[PDB]
Point group: C3
Chain length 198, copies 3
């Protein structure tokens, strides 16, 4: 069954599954996250589809950053209370998540050997960088910086694995104006990391 | 069989398999396209090797764009009449294409759930961006912009899936002078998308 | 056995496994390289963790390039005497290298059909480009250019496959401008190439 090689959020969930902004008091966007087992690595495929007005209106600002913090327990299961993503991940079932148990969830996690916790000497190894784009109302591509930090620092005793994905930009002109903003959508960002063993 | 997880053009086809320019009277380049099933995703690996002098001479201009439009039917089979690529894709057979029937061709296609057709409010989700490089005669790397649009709009009724790939550059100087232009080759660009189910 | 789809260095080797710089008294860094078979392609995942003080202090200079030269024999075995990486690759065994025979080592190699040797007219096809980042002591990300040349030129009769990975920067400011005591860590760079057949 190839479906168990994927751990994901499903494609375009009906309702917002993620509370990205600190100012938000409920889910403000759809986090689309797909983790695929690819040999010793995980192929991580991530983007956001904005839902709340305040999140969508971030496209009108010149200086923005927002972070999806994903915390997982020792079994590789998402801790929804601590995490930005409020719906657990599961396997592929068509375009949706499966509903059963998760096979080898821990082996989707970022390796604590490759990406340690509380190790100042190896702190640089926890960082992955890249770019994605916001497609503007005029069809131009607005580049957005992405920083991923794997593990490095835990926030609670039961947080065994961490993925923190930060989207940011600092420009002279905002992606949109107040009247042109619609939905904050980031283009998919694919990154790779050495996966934990079961 | 691992070979059926690849749907591709084969390596460096003897003859030009693609008509990139409308002004060309026949195939003017080799489109190298490899689609690999990677869990819930497809790994899409693409570049061009120019063949015709007119296409190759595009490297002598400062402002250029060209697009490979790939249209597929409901079975996931290439519609060569509509598409830039004039030879159907098939599975891996060594460095070449297999000649038999394609297994699960529909699941190589970009998801219509992830990448809808004619949906204005979700149109931003259809776009993927990146960069490749042209290796110049002096061995400097000339960056080329890439815009990919999946599905979004279908030009004919039997078209069920679309992959449109646009290479472009707009610079102060052309990649090559008149006496240094040889072959327009783009470095491989790899992108990812959520695949359709069978 | 999925473990045989990876050919790698293992995670964070105890000792430096690579001599990046010709002048170094011994191995000067940890080359972390993971090659994963992905359909017709190899997903190549590479970065460097500096070990020696002389190599780590390269980040204080403004115009630096260094290259990992990886040479393999006709069976796909690393030729350590000729190569920057001085420890053979092997399969995944947890976070470490396996210690047995390598299964189908040849099909991890860059295709000589896709990436020829001594063919000037096709030389542009041998190149892959990208960027990674050096994380500075202030935790800012400094972009580093990466160039990969596959095959193209052999250095000895038994060198059947070559992977040459060059990290470089040439900017107004050095990657590290705040201290002489910080580890040269490059963020992971992932590239793709068409693999040889067994």
């Amino acid at each position: 069954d190839d479906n168990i090689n994927t751990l994901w959020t499903g494609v375009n969930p009906t309702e917002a599954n993620c509370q990205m902004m600190d100012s938000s008091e409920s889910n403000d966007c759809k986090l689309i996250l797909t983790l695929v087992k690819t040999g010793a690595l995980v192929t991580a495929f991530v983007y956001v589809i904005g839902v709340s007005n305040n999140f969508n209106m971030l496209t009108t600002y010149r200086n923005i950053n927002f972070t999806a913090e994903l915390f997982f327990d020792s079994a590789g299961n998402l801790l929804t209370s601590l995490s930005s993503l409020k719906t657990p991940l599961n396997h592929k079932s068509g375009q949706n998540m499966a509903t059963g148990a998760i096979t080898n969830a821990k082996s989707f996690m970022p390796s604590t050997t490759a990406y340690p916790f509380n190790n100042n000497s190896r702190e640089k190894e926890n960082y992955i960088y890249g770019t994605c784009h916001y497609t503007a109302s005029d069809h131009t591509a607005f580049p957005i910086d992405i920083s991923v930090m794997l593990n490095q620092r835990a926030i609670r005793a039961d947080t065994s694995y961490c993925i923190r994905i930060t989207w940011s930009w600092n420009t002279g002109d905002a992606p949109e104006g107040q009247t042109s903003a619609t939905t904050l959508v980031t283009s998919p960002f694919t990154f790779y990391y050495i996966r934990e063993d079961d």
